Amino acid sequence: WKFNRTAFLHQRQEILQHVDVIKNFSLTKNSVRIGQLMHYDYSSHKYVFSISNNFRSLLPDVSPIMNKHYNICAVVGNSGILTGSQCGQEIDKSDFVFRCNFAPTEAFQRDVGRKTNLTTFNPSILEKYYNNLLTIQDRNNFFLSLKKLDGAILWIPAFFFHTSATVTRTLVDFFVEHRGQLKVQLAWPGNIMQHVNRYWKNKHLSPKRLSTGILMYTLASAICEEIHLYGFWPFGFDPNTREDLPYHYYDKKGTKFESHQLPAEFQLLYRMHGEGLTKLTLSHCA
Amino acid sequence: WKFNRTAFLHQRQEILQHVDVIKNFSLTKNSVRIGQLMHYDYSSHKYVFSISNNFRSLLPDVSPIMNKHYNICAVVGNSGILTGSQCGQEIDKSDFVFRCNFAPTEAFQRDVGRKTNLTTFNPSILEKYYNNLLTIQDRNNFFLSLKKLDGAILWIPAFFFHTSATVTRTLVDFFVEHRGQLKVQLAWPGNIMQHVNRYWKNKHLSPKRLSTGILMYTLASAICEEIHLYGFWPFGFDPNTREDLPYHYYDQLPAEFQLLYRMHGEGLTKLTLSHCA
Numbered sequence: 001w002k003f004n005r006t007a008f009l010h011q012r013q014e015i016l017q018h019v020d021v022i023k024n025f026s027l028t029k030n031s032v033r034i035g036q037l038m039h040y041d042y043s044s045h046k047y048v049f050s051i052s053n054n055f056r057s058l059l060p061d062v063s064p065i066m067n068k069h070y071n072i073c074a075v076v077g078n079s080g081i082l083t084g085s086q087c088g089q090e091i092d093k094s095d096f097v098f099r100c101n102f103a104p105t106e107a108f109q110r111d112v113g114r115k116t117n118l119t120t121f122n123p124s125i126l127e128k129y130y131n132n133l134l135t136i137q138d139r140n141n142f143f144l145s146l147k148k149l150d151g152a153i154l155w156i157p158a159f160f161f162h163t164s165a166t167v168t169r170t171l172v173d174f175f176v177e178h179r180g181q182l183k184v185q186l187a188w189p190g191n192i193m194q195h196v197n198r199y200w201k202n203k204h205l206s207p208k209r210l211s212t213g214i215l216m217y218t219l220a221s222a223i224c225e226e227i228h229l230y231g232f233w234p235f236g237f238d239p240n241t242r243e244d245l246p247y248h249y250y251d252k253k254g255t256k257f258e259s260h261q262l263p264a265e266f267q268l269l270y271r272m273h274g275e276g277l278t279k280l281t282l283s284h285c286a
Numbered sequence: 287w288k289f290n291r292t293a294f295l296h297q298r299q300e301i302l303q304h305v306d307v308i309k310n311f312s313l314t315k316n317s318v319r320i321g322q323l324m325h326y327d328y329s330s331h332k333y334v335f336s337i338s339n340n341f342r343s344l345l346p347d348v349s350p351i352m353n354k355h356y357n358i359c360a361v362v363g364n365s366g367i368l369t370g371s372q373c374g375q376e377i378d379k380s381d382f383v384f385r386c387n388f389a390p391t392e393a394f395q396r397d398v399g400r401k402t403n404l405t406t407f408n409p410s411i412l413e414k415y416y417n418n419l420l421t422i423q424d425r426n427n428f429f430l431s432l433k434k435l436d437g438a439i440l441w442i443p444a445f446f447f448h449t450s451a452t453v454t455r456t457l458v459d460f461f462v463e464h465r466g467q468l469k470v471q472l473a474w475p476g477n478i479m480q481h482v483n484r485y486w487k488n489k490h491l492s493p494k495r496l497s498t499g500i501l502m503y504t505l506a507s508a509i510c511e512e513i514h515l516y517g518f519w520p521f522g523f524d525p526n527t528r529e530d531l532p533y534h535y536y537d538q539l540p541a542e543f544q545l546l547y548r549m550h551g552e553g554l555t556k557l558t559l560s561h562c563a
């Protein structure tokens with residue numbers, strides 16, 4: 001595979017025509033008022049969420065990616081194809097690693113690496129794995145996971161669907177309560193999907209909802225010189241051996257495989273791979 | 287029915303030996319610290335709720351019932367027995383009316399009255415009737431209902447069960463957001479049920495959970511000279527007409543009812559089970 005830098009820089013430019021990526025990356029203190037009602041990207045207009053004093057105080061003063069440049073970025077999706085890949089070392093060699101939905105790395109370092117400079121956080125994660133921080137043990141458990149992220153960016157899309165409302169309140173209270181004890185940089189994108197969709201609509205991709213992976217590719221394009229994709233393979237068989245693969249690399253070996261058209265996303269990324277825009281890894285790195 | 291004032295004043299003294307009612311009525315700003323962890327009365331100790339700056343700012347500075355003394359109080363429970371009772375007028379004649387769980391009055395004035403000086407708010411009400419304030423319309427509805435409460439007290443027990451955690455955050459944010467626009471006096475009791483249960487334990491009543499009604503009786507005893515009960519009847523037939531009755535008038539309780547009937551018979555309180563007209 002040979003990187004075609006020119007083609008990729010052309011893609012970046014084309015993305016920037018539809019997406020102000022530096023701005024879209026996160027709301028900032030001065031871009032919202034206290035009390036302001038937010039709507040949700042994928043919900044009916046009637047659904048709203050008021051920004052408290054507290055929520056606003058958690059927003060960054062300036063975009064966390066402003067004047068940032070990384071040469072080689074890894075964007076790591078969560079496919080079961082990473083299991084046994086030994087891509088850890090190659091991923092960690094990147095200048096910047098994006099991960100998705102707070103995926104675990106410690107237990108899987110050999111395959112997925114231990115370097116994390118950004119991880120996303122679908123709010124459902126707090127309900128699904130941290131019980132909405134209802135108990136002392138869940139609170140401790142979340143706190144430790146966050147501490148292990150050190151100074152990475154935690155990218156929390158709270159305004160895409162209205163079911164995030166309650167978790168957002170819980171998160172805001174937890175982060176205010178623990179202000180000063182964590183180095184994680186919070187980032188909170190607003191209603192950005194009408195802009196992100198515009199780019200991918202021209203490539204003949206428009207599902208109900210773009211996936212987190214492709215949303216990370218989109219932002220990486222603004223600040224990375226060369227993007228290398230890992231963990232993008234939304235199928236239930238290994239492309240080589242054909243053995244059952246779980247949907248996620250941290251599902252129990254065994255596990256059997258709505259709004260996404262992940263296959264169409266994949267075919268489009270494979271296409272880009274072939275044009276030299278980006279490197280999609282589908283095999284063992286070692 | 288003839289009030290036995292002496293028996294009632296003895297009951298009040300006995301309640302006050304176990305329950306500092308005026309204090310237990312509500313947490314106040316200075317009785318919690320920011321970042322303090324609250325436990326829940328009926329939940330395992332592991333469940334906690336961290337006091338936010340915002341939650342604290344919604345607490346009253348002093349108990350809203352301190353030095354309030356009313357003569358006749360109505361405590362209105364939510365039984366379907368009120369339907370067609372025409373007790374509205376007799377309820378509204380009271381000096382002070384307690385209602386339960388934000389029950390509706392407008393559509394039912396003739397039967398339940400329109401006077402409200404306190405209403406309780408099980409946090410589940412927000413989920414059940416206001417959709418967690420997720421929409422503009424639910425927010426508008428809740429706002430108007432609250433505005434109609436004028437300067438009444440809204441008594442919100444948020445620390446009895448851990449399922450109230452999330453809705454507490456929703457409520458806090460809504461009240462902070464509308465700070466200045468509502469005259470309602472918020473009240474937020476803490477962990478009071480070990481004290482309240484002590485009084486009722488001696489009367490041979492101890493279920494998993496005392497009902498809101500009997501909790502309102504307990505508090506009314508401290509600030510009312512005479513309590514009159516309406517909407518207390520947890521059974522599915524009407525004692526007079528014998529027709530099926532809904533549980534609520536806008537659709538162990540038996541031990542509680544038998545105990546209140548007992549108190550009625552002793553002249554402590556007046557339990558109305560019939561049409562007022």
Ligand SMILES: CC(=O)N[C@@H]1[C@@H](O)[C@H](O[C@@H]2O[C@H](CO)[C@H](O)[C@H](O[C@]3(C(=O)O)C[C@H](O)[C@@H](NC(C)=O)[C@H]([C@H](O)[C@H](O)CO)O3)[C@H]2O)[C@@H](COS(=O)(=O)O)O[C@H]1O
Pocket residue numbers: 122123124125157158159160161163164209210211212215258259260
């Ligand atoms: C009761 C029932 O089955 N109803 C379902 C809806 O719950 C369901 O919506 C999704 O529900 C989950 C909770 O289990 C989440 O609330 C989800 O919201 C997120 C999420 O937190 O996971 C919101 C994030 O902002 C999204 N992240 C993005 C867009 O990058 C994220 C993401 O789109 C999904 O995780 C999909 O991978 O969703 C609710 O969307 C709904 C099914 O729709 S969807 O497949 O989730 O699009 O269907 C109702 O009937």
Ligand SMILES: CC(=O)N[C@@H]1[C@@H](O)[C@H](O[C@@H]2O[C@H](CO)[C@H](O)[C@H](O[C@]3(C(=O)O)C[C@H](O)[C@@H](NC(C)=O)[C@H]([C@H](O)[C@H](O)CO)O3)[C@H]2O)[C@@H](COS(=O)(=O)O)O[C@H]1O
Pocket residue numbers: 408409410411443444445446447449450494495496497498501
């Ligand atoms: C999964 C399942 O079915 N488990 C049930 C629980 O549903 C049940 O929990 C009660 O859950 C309801 C859900 O609507 C409420 O969250 C309730 O909490 C309140 C309430 O908000 O209504 C908490 C209030 O502070 C209580 N007010 C008081 C004590 O004055 C109030 C009160 O006890 C009412 O009778 C119930 O509304 O409850 C949760 O307690 C759980 C316990 O059942 S029960 O409500 O005692 O009947 O039982 C599980 O089986």
Ligand SMILES: CC(=O)N[C@@H]1[C@@H](O)[C@@H](F)[C@@](OP(=O)(O)OC[C@H]2O[C@@H](n3ccc(N)nc3=O)[C@H](O)[C@@H]2O)(C(=O)O)O[C@H]1[C@H](O)[C@H](O)CO
Pocket residue numbers: 076077078079080100101122124125210211212213214231232233234235246247248260262
């Ligand atoms: C249970 C459930 O519904 N799983 C969804 C899943 O449909 C997926 F859509 C997505 O992301 P998630 O699986 O974490 O995976 C991160 C990204 O990796 C790529 N990928 C993933 C698996 C795979 N086999 N081939 C791939 O290509 C996709 O671009 C995906 O967006 C999402 O928001 O897009 O979110 C999760 C969960 O909400 C999340 O993991 C909570 O812990």
Ligand SMILES: CC(=O)N[C@@H]1[C@@H](O)[C@@H](F)[C@@](OP(=O)(O)OC[C@H]2O[C@@H](n3ccc(N)nc3=O)[C@H](O)[C@@H]2O)(C(=O)O)O[C@H]1[C@H](O)[C@H](O)CO
Pocket residue numbers: 362363364365366386387408410411414496497498499500517518519520521532533534539
């Ligand atoms: C399903 C559910 O969650 N229902 C509960 C219910 O188990 C009951 F426990 C109680 O109160 P709720 O029914 O509104 O009624 C107020 C009081 O009226 C008396 N009563 C009621 C019905 C009846 N036929 N005869 C009576 O004697 C009881 O003293 C009760 O305390 C509570 O905490 O006591 O709270 C409600 C809900 O939280 C509320 O209605 C949501 O809007």
Ligand SMILES: *[C@@H]1O[C@H](CO[C@@H]2O[C@@H](C)[C@@H](O)[C@@H](O)[C@@H]2O)[C@@H](O[C@@H]2O[C@H](CO)[C@@H](O)[C@H](O)[C@H]2NC(C)=O)[C@H](O)[C@H]1NC(C)=O
Pocket residue numbers: 071072
């Ligand atoms: C930015 O990275 C490019 C590309 O680096 C190469 O490919 C990466 C994925 C990784 O494998 C690197 O180790 C590879 O070197 C660098 O461009 C290369 O630079 C080296 C150093 O002089 C040179 O030997 C190669 O010929 C160049 N290769 C290509 C394809 O252009 C570049 O040096 C990096 N720049 C900075 C400032 O980090």
Ligand SMILES: *[C@@H]1O[C@H](CO)[C@@H](O[C@@H]2O[C@H](CO)[C@@H](O)[C@H](O)[C@H]2NC(C)=O)[C@H](O)[C@H]1NC(C)=O
Pocket residue numbers: 004006007275276
């Ligand atoms: C890099 O990719 C681009 C994107 O398609 C290629 O650029 C165009 O290629 C076609 C080939 O006929 C021409 O129509 C254009 O004139 C090319 N653009 C430019 C700016 O020259 C390019 O061929 C690719 N480079 C490599 C090494 O494959």
Ligand SMILES: *[C@@H]1O[C@H](CO)[C@@H](O[C@@H]2O[C@H](CO)[C@@H](O)[C@H](O)[C@H]2NC(C)=O)[C@H](O)[C@H]1NC(C)=O
Pocket residue numbers: 095096097114115116117150
């Ligand atoms: C990307 O994130 C990693 C952490 O995963 C950062 O690398 C660490 O930096 C600290 C401080 O220098 C070192 O002590 C660690 O040894 C590094 N850890 C790993 C796993 O490599 C890295 O510097 C971040 N890169 C950025 C922000 O460009």
Ligand SMILES: *[C@@H]1O[C@H](CO)[C@@H](O[C@@H]2O[C@H](CO)[C@@H](O)[C@H](O)[C@H]2NC(C)=O)[C@H](O)[C@H]1NC(C)=O
Pocket residue numbers: 302303304305306307309310311312476477478481
């Ligand atoms: C509810 O009221 C009871 C009093 O009836 C309070 O309990 C007393 O608290 C003081 C000071 O903390 C103790 O020294 C007493 O011994 C307690 N009395 C009993 C009988 O235990 C209680 O603090 C009040 N609680 C709230 C939240 O208001």
Ligand SMILES: *[C@@H]1O[C@H](CO)[C@@H](O[C@@H]2O[C@H](CO)[C@@H](O)[C@H](O)[C@H]2NC(C)=O)[C@H](O)[C@H]1NC(C)=O
Pocket residue numbers: 381382383400401402403436438
């Ligand atoms: C109890 O609450 C009621 C409201 O439900 C109060 O009565 C209202 O008071 C205003 C101001 O004095 C009057 O203009 C209204 O006509 C009254 N409304 C009703 C329905 O009677 C009443 O004052 C409150 N009582 C106490 C003791 O606080």
Ligand SMILES: *[C@@H]1O[C@H](CO)[C@@H](O)[C@H](O)[C@H]1NC(C)=O
Pocket residue numbers: 017018019020021023024025026190191192195
């Ligand atoms: C996203 O970018 C567009 C320009 O692409 C802009 O007009 C809009 O405000 C942005 N939205 C954000 C940062 O939420």
Ligand SMILES: *[C@@H]1O[C@H](CO)[C@@H](O)[C@H](O)[C@H]1NC(C)=O
Pocket residue numbers: 290292293296553
């Ligand atoms: C009223 O109640 C008290 C307490 O039991 C009792 O001693 C008194 O005799 C009663 N008086 C009546 C029924 O007139």
Ligand SMILES: *[C@@H]1O[C@H](CO)[C@@H](O)[C@H](O)[C@H]1NC(C)=O
Pocket residue numbers: 357358511
């Ligand atoms: C209490 O109400 C009754 C009934 O009208 C009345 O007769 C009695 O004197 C009232 N007032 C006081 C201060 O007790």
